[PDB]
Each structure stands twice: as C-alpha cells, then as structure tokens.
C-alpha cells in the first residue's frame, strides 16, 4: 500500500528531499489533502472565523471564560479546548498585555501537540514535523536574535501551562516554524491565520510551480496547475510571483537558504515588463531606473516591517506619495506602482471607499494577468475582489463577468465543488 496514493517522496539533487509523481496528474486534479497538524486564528479574525477550523460564520459561540475563543459550536469548542486551555485564563488575568506573536503562538500549539500525540500523524505520512529542516548553521544574527525574543514570549505567556524542552531544542523548533510553516488566506486572500502542514512542506519551491495549496476551512489541498508526468519532481511556490527574478531571489536567500534556478529564474523573461518604464523625450537611462528600483524595494521592506503598528491613513499616504514620486520614471504597469496600487486599494477597502478602491482595482487587473502564471491565486482573488465592488455599486454586467474571471481559476486551484465557489455562484444569483 501507498502511503499518500500516486505520490512519493524522494531525493531531489541539490534540493534536499522533495515530492515525486508515480502517475500522471492533468489540469486541476488533486495530487492529496493534508490535515493541518498546528494552527491558530489570526487576532484579527477573532469574532468572525471559528477559531477551531477557521469557518467564516455569523453567531459563532464564544468562550463564557474568557469571551476571546469563538467556535461554530461546542464540538469545535471541545477540540480546540487542548490548545485555548493554555491561554483562556491568561487573556482573563492580563487584558491586551497578553499579546504573544502568531509564530508564539503556533509554537505553543506544537509543543502541546508532540506531548499528547508522539508518533507521527494523518498529516505526517511522507514528512514529520521532527525531521523538518532549521538551518540553524545559515541563520544571520537578525534572524537568531528574533528566535530569541520569541523564546523568551513564550516563557512569559505559556509558562504556567506548557512544559519546555531545552533551549537548544526551541531554537531547533522556532528555526524549523520559520523554514515551513504557513499562512492560510481566504478567497481574497485576506490573512487568516498561521498552520503547520508536514506532508505539504515536503514540497519544494519553483517560480514556475506545477501545483497550487489552497485551504478548505484548515484541510491543505495540493492541485494541479499543468500536466505532472510519472518521474516529474511536485513544486509549489513559497512567495509572491509578482516580482522580478532579484527580489524573488533575495527573498528566497533570507527565509528558505537557497537561490532559484527554476525557468523563469534563469531566462529572467518576465523582468522586462515587470519593470517597465515609460516612453519619454529622453527615456530613462539604467542609473534611474536602478535608483528608482532601489527605491521602490525599500518602501516595499519598510511597509514590511512597519505592518503591525501604521494605521490605514498612513499606509495610504505612503502609497499615494510613492506612486506619485515612482511614475516619473515608470509606468503604471511596473510592479513597484502596482504594490502601491494594491495597498492603496487595501485602504480604500477598509475605509469604505468603494469606487475608490474599484478605480485601484481597474488598474491593476490587466497587468497582473499579464505578470503572475496563467492559474494564479492573486489573479482569481483580483478579479473577486473587483467583481464584488462592481456588485455592491450596482454593476450587475461588470460584476458577473469579473466574478466568472475568479471562478474559472479557481475551479482549478480550489476544485469545481470548493465550498467558495459554491458562495460566489450565490452572489451572481442574488
Ligand atoms: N528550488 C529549490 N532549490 C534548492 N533548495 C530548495 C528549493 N526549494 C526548496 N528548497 C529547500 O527546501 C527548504 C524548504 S522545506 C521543503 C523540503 C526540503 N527540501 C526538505 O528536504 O525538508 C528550503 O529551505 C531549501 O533548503
Ligand atoms: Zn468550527
Ligand atoms: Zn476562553
Ligand atoms: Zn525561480
């Protein structure tokens, strides 16, 4: 018997180990589903999802200790008491001084997990969470001192409830959350939450993946987004396929340890359009274009790590005067506008501002068709986006059409019966 049917892992060259096909797979099949083996609810989420299986719902029940926890019923309330028990009572005792990071978080939930449950799980069939790597011997000292300060977190809200292995063994464990952990979004690709899925991080990346993960309340699914032939090594992608090759490598460097060599990263063919320029008297020499690339990746990194604490007015006028300073020399198409164009969209959202973000969103559509594979999850959630706005202006023509563009992808990355395809096709009929 096959542990995971049609699949294996393997040895893949340079690439540590890897998952393989044993039989073909065509446009949109499911390769497996993996059970989430540690998750929790983003904060800001609370209220709104089931904080047991992430169900987006109206009258959830909450905890009556702590009135934090909400959950569809008592049934997700009695499976998720294991991991909330460690810290019902200290969100009652400490108000919003009780403020572990999500990374805090998930950790607390391994450890409780590997206590009760030793052997390897239903999510654990081809990689377990103790043989994930850590490089711990590649780690810059940034990256060290943040495990550190994570460490110490989780002495100071879990101590009471969880009972620690070594210090060396909690940097082993942060170090590996790090190196495969992930992030579930829903179908606008809104952060939920935080997720460890060991048969998932089996996968290794390309920029030119041949599968897409997408969730089903906390079920990882793995599909098909070209033909995958027996012999042929399952990649997925870890980042943002919007960039151009340096940035995407860049990235890759400073999370996973390695550099790219996928197609795209070696012909470098999509770096062209993604930094285009516009058409001018003189036009830009390479010096300003570089000092404007330089520019526009800084404001990236400092949006980055500036995330947490800037309110929405002031990630929008950061946006607006970027992309006003940016447009001297690019075009609107340049992906660096288009980060812009995105978050300033994400503000125009968040403050009602509905033609305004519908304006944002315009913009953006065509050239993230053209920039991000031909089945992309930013595109399917970009054309959802747009087709709601549309819906809720009284665009009924616009809106439909928009919203057919996100079921189309999504029919293959979600699967046709996806509970969210089921949602979208209810708004065309209403
Ligand atoms: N395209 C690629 N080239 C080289 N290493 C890669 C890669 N994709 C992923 N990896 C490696 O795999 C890590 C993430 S976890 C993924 C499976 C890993 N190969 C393992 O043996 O457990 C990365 O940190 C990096 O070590
Ligand atoms: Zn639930
Ligand atoms: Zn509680
Ligand atoms: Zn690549």
Redesign the pocket.
Known sequence: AEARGGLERFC?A?????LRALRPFHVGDLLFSCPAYACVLTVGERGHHCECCFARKEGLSKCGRCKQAFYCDVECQKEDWPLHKLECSSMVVLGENWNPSETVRLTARILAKQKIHPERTPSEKL?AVR???S?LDKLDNEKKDLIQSDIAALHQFYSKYLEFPDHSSLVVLFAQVN??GFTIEDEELSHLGSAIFPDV??????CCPNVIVTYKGTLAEVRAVQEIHPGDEV?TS?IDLLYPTEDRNDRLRDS???????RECTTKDKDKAKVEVRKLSSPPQAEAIRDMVRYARNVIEEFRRAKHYKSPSELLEICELSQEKMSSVFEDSNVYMLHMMYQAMGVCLYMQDWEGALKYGQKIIKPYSKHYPVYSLNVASMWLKLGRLYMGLENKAAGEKALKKAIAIMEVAHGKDHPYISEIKQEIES
């Open positions: 893949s340079g690439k540590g180990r890897g990689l043989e994930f790597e490089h190196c495969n991080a089996l996968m290794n990346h390309s990649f870890y996973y340890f390695f550099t790219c060599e996928c």
